[PDB]
Amino acid sequence: IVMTASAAIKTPQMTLPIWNDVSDEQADTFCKSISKVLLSEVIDKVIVTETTGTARSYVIHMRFFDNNEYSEEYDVSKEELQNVISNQFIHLLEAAIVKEIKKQKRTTGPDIGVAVPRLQNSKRLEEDNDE
Amino acid sequence: LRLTAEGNKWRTDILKTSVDTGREAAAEVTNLDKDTPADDPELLKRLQEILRDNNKSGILDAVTSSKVNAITSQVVSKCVPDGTMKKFPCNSMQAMALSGAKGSNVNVSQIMCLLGQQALEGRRVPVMVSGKTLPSFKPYETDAMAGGYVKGRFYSGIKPQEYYFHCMAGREGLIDTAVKTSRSGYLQRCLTKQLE
Amino acid sequence: SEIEIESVQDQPSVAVGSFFKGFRAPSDTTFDLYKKKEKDEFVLHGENERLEYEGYTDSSSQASNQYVVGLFNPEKKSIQLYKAPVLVSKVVSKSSKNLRGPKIK
Amino acid sequence: SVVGSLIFCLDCGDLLENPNAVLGSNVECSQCKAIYPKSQFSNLKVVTTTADDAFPSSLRAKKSVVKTSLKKNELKDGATIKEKCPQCGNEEMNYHTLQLRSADEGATVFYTCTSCGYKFRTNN
Amino acid sequence: SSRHGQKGVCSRKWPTIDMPFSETGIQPDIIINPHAFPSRMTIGMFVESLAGKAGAL
Amino acid sequence: CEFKLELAADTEKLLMVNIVEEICRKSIIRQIPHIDRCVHPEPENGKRVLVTEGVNFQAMWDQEAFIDVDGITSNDVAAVLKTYGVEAARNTIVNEINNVFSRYAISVSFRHLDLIADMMTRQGTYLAFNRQGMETSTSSFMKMSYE
Amino acid sequence: MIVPVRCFSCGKVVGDKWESYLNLLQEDELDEGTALSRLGLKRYCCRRMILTHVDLIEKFLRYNPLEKR
Amino acid sequence: RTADFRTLERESRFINPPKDKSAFPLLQEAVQPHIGSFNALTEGPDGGLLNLGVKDIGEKVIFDGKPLNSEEISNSGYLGNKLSVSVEQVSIAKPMSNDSAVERKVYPSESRQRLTSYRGKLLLKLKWSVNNGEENLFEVRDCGGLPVMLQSNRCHLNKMSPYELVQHKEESDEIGGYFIVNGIEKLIRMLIVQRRNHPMAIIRPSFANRGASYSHYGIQIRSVRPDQTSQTNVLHYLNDGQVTFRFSWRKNEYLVPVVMILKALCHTSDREIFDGIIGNDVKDSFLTDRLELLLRGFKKRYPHLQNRTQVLQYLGDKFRVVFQASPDQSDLEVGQEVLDRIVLVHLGKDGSQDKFRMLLFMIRKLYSLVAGECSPDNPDATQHQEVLLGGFLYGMILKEKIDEYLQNIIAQVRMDINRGMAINFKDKRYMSRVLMRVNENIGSKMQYFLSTGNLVSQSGLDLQQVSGYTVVAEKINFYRFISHFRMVHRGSFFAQLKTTTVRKLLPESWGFLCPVHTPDGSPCGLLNHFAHKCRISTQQSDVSRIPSILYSLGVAPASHTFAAGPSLCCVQIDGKIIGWVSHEQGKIIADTLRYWKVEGKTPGLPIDLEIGYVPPSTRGQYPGLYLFGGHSRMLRPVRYLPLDKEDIVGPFEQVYMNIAVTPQEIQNNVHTHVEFTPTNILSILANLTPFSDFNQSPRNMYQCQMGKQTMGTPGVALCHRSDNKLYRLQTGQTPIVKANLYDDYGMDNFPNGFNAVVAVISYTGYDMDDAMIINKSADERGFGYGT
Amino acid sequence: KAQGRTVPIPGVKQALEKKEGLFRKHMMGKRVNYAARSVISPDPNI
Amino acid sequence: FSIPDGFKKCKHLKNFPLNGDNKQQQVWLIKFPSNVDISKLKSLPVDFESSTTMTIDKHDYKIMDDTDNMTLLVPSESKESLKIASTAPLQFDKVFSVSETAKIPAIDYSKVRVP
Ligand SMILES: [Zn+2]
Ligand SMILES: [Zn+2]
Ligand SMILES: [Zn+2]
């Protein structure tokens, strides 16, 4: 506040006063409706069956939690999950695999013999409180 | 600093229920019905799951602490002052805390009743990878003493296990005074130069 | 259940040599056994058209452990014991004995 | 020997190259020029499952056998001492202890009200 | 300071006539204020006091 | 959800599980801009409220059926200034500084906080007590004796 | 160093009672308490004076820069 | 009938300093890690650390700029005449003074009064080998006055009895452990360093910010040479699935693929590496893919490297400049020279098979950490650390200075051959000419380290800090002085960190590090003090007879078994993986070893041996039977329940051990050991505090700092001293109320206070909280008088 | 603002900003005449 | 090869009864410590699973049995030296390991735990 008048606060918050006609259950459902939901939060298991034939075949099976479980915990429908995977996730996955192929062919390995960067008042720091 | 024979009897009787508290809380966080034994193989496997997670250990520590601190509050409420041998105005230790001359009823209770649960950085006593809080205690021990709950008082003395745990909590405060980069010097200097 | 022993041989005869998981070989090549004279150390050596086999006994294991191999009978219930040394065998290829200049630039 | 996605020579033990990178019908080891394949190696598969710790969520936390979340209501302060409340006048008052400043400096007590829930900090 | 971490500066060198005198006829060498002990909780010094007296007698 | 991915013969070995894992925790199903999580705490002094871990007033304005849009508080001073004006930001400064002191049970007269807030809002903006805020000050000697 | 002249608390001469105290412990084989009583030390202040005396002077004297060996 | 004070006994000992064994052995046991450490520098098996150090620095080669003139392609390749210079032996003499002819003995008292250093003549047999020993020239060269440690192997006081010490102007029960440098008593401060020869799985965010696609996960082993010099090897798990080997030479870091360093050690197949890391757990898809990334990656990057020799040559070619090994040394020689000097040096030369087995174990531990099978090892915890003793540190920097000394001889010859050419190496005249043009005063260089604490080195050792290795042995009072030799610091580098975990008092420190004795403020939790019964390892013995005992107890040999992972127990002796067993049998061996250890019937098993057993757990520490016998180890005595005999325990093995405090607290089926006295967990000064179990925690801590700042007795031999400043209490008194350990350390030799009539009273009005009243008539009578 | 010489001599800008600066160390704050310093001791009779 | 020095070639090798009929044949492997004498023992007590007990001249032993690479080399002829065992590589039917076991004494609690 006083010293930096930061526009980028560490913990930005909003206090929302709820009405009387909105119940404790309705308010908790509303909390879920605004809270950010990630794909990670609805996935239980991912099974990748890498099989090489003819072409690298990658069978990615997304085992999510039960439909009624994540719909009651995140207020997310199956339709909402379909749109995100078919539009965002696959485009994001394809870009990540392409980037990993380029990174593999770019640098074949670290340079041998060439030095790399290191990993990581003296009496004053050893002075006790009475000193 | 002395309690009467009557007052000291109350102290031992309330602190006698504290032995069960350790396992009771351990059985509550772990979610096990009929209150399973302290040496139960399923319980010991369940407490290991808690040991490996910082959040799970936090739930265990906060539950056990609230339960043992409730036993502490009971001892203090019963024994002080209705159980003290010498009483106010003659009990100068009691008088100084009540007058506001020096000290409080909390310091008085650590002297005459018990030190209580030794809290370290909001939680209980630190535990090793083996599940032991000290080489003296059993791995995954479901006891209040093992967690840092000191039944001993400064008048009667404190056991070596309690002594080491008190040393931990005592030092913890001095460590915080050494690692505190926050200073009000520059904050005030910036205001005073613009408001002079 | 006490099992009786028929014969014990303290002389060299049969030997065991560990290679790696999934070792087949041509199964027509020979392995020459060697001995040194408290505890005797053994050396194994074989030869092939494309490969070469070399084996030896571990110095720390020989003086401390004594390995024996036996044949069991299902009716007589008697075992014929023979001392067998364990030889840590490695296989060298035709690609070996390849090297560049001792000093490069 | 063939193990999962890997293929090793039965003669020397050197890891054999992928059949896609080298020429068709036949494959050979870098160490010994051994005759391969036997055509029984097949189009191998490797079932790789997620880390289980990979997706930390509120639902995954609820799937754990032990208590992972504390009740909003069931929250008992850290202990209670019989101290006069400065807010109005109450008997039950919660507390907290720690040793601040020097080893010569006294013990600081952090009081907490029950009727209103007002924090405090007083040394003596 | 005592062997219990109770250090204090010399406020004054009080005369023996002005010093409190015991029934035995002894005036203390050092005077510690009772308001030091409720905050520090140095009970080791309290037991040291009655132990030292018992051992002197 | 099952889907097959076909790669070239030259792509060879790749750690797909680790690649998928990282993208899943990066993929957002639903997110309201600048807001991460909305929680329901215990009613503060009898007032039924919801505490958000983010700031976006215009988004909350659409939730009129649930929220009283004339009482929507925020700790972010700059965000309050941008949407509700200098006087609202001024009131946020006096309230927020008071929250810092009230937590440690320290009482500071509002006459002090109001003066500090008025000095920060003297230019109609949100100036801090530092070299930047000071730039708009008459005395060069005062400035020279600061830094 | 040496036995102090007079008790710090009251002022009763204690300096003449040091060598006499060791004689009551050695030759007479008496206990610490009874030996102090025979010297005429009844106040616990006068009692501790001799009882608690170290006598480092005997250790200090063994270093003499005026005599060889 | 009582726990009385010795009055008659005390005064008799004051007049009569014993002529036999000195009283208070615990006082000499306090300076045992200091004297012992310096003693091992010359005395002991293998001829001491200093003879081992010069044996490890080896030769230093330079070639003459002269042709062959042979009747040829050999002439062009001919480098000239070879000159290999080394040091065979290293000698240290007790302090002497020559006046040019006959030498005289100089004692510490003289050095203090003279305001000079207590130096001993340093000699070292130089080897001047020409054309690979066709003519050898030896010369014992005087290399200045090396400051000698008091009451040590090379001190005139070590034999002396209390009587003899007083006759030589020293304290009757003189401890030693310090160095007299320019009249100032200076000691080498003990340091907390990573436990030797143990792979440590660590999560560090520091590892990520160094390179591209670097994770938090990694392994760190602090390999130590027999000469006590250390060389740390780090393993990194990259997000690509690649594993890299990190090390340090000179003051630069270097990275090499682990599959390259593996194939350089011994001839192996790709499947031998597969069996070495992945055991019977072949179905583990996580491991199946990661290992394929390593093997295929090496084949892709280095397809040419098809044998052990080619790998060594490729390694030699890239490190020929940094390792300075040139110009006749082949890439195969330089390659092996890199391996022998960097990769897992604790197993040493002619142990490449042992280095290979240990490296595979580190890769499996690394993969167990990434997956989560293994919890990360805590470096800040007492279990995963040892104590670098002053004498060992002194030997390390000495080895560094003699390496520099040989480099300087070559530098002078290089100057000579690059100008006037001068003459040949076979002439003694030339050798004598070179040698007196080289600065051979190592004594002054070692005197500097003891006078500044500044570490000047070409490698920088395996330490982070560069200053404060030496501190003045402050003798303001004996309590402060004796605490110096029991004080241990984590490191100067750790003092400048926002992390509080380092300062935190942990249960791992029980009986090793004192919970009370730590300063207030800035050095809180950093400047620790050991427990009074805690001991530090000076060397190792019977270690070679233990594998024979293990193999007989059912340990299957690692060379034949070929199965690795957390699913099986790994048996190791000082970081040497000897075999494999089941976890069930793993505990059986660990319990039966301890039984034959305490029993004096077994000749090959020493009582000081550390048996670190780690049982299998769900996402806990990496399991195994990690045995230790080496130097610098933290050790403490406990009572072993069966047989009722003393047992020596380390901080690593204690973590899983059940040791009861009092015999009445022993619980059935869950206790194997009991403490002798709980006083064993506290320091000397912490034990000296009366009724400490009745005082509040920070007051007991403040008393240690108080007793250290008191105007007590700094000594009785003051008339032969010349110190900066000394504080002396005139009227010292023996405490009526005292711990019996006060007599065990003979603290009556140095009284720190006085017994006073104290009344807890508020009367004057001038006494309140931080102010106390002193009696005028008491002060007038000499109460609390000082000079 | 000057080239490196084989710590340089401070310029007049450096003289005005040595540490806290001439303004802070010798104008806003100053060492004074007719002043004393001593350890404080308690007294209930004054 | 020829190296190392002090090593002499094995010319004479004793006969091994190898047939592998079908009432079937079994090949066993046993691990033994250097302290025990094999020529002294003419009978070995062994039963199925890990459970086993043995006492040879004051020393106690245990015969660990495990179901589950090592390659067996059997001599076909004395002049043919050693060759790899095969039927259709060869594996052992039953694998055993002798481990020296010591009896740790029971803690005398009545003597050590004193009030
Ligand atoms: Zn091959
Ligand atoms: Zn109230
Ligand atoms: Zn007196």
PDB file of C-alpha atoms in Angstrom, chain H residues 102 106 187 419 627:
ATOM      1  CA  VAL H 102      73.372 -27.424  17.485  1.00  0.00           C
ATOM      2  CA  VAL H 106      61.517 -24.638  22.010  1.00  0.00           C
ATOM      3  CA  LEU H 187      42.053 -23.154  16.257  1.00  0.00           C
ATOM      4  CA  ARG H 419      64.597 -18.631 -23.044  1.00  0.00           C
ATOM      5  CA  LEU H 627      27.469 -50.017   6.869  1.00  0.00           C
TER       6      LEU H 627
END
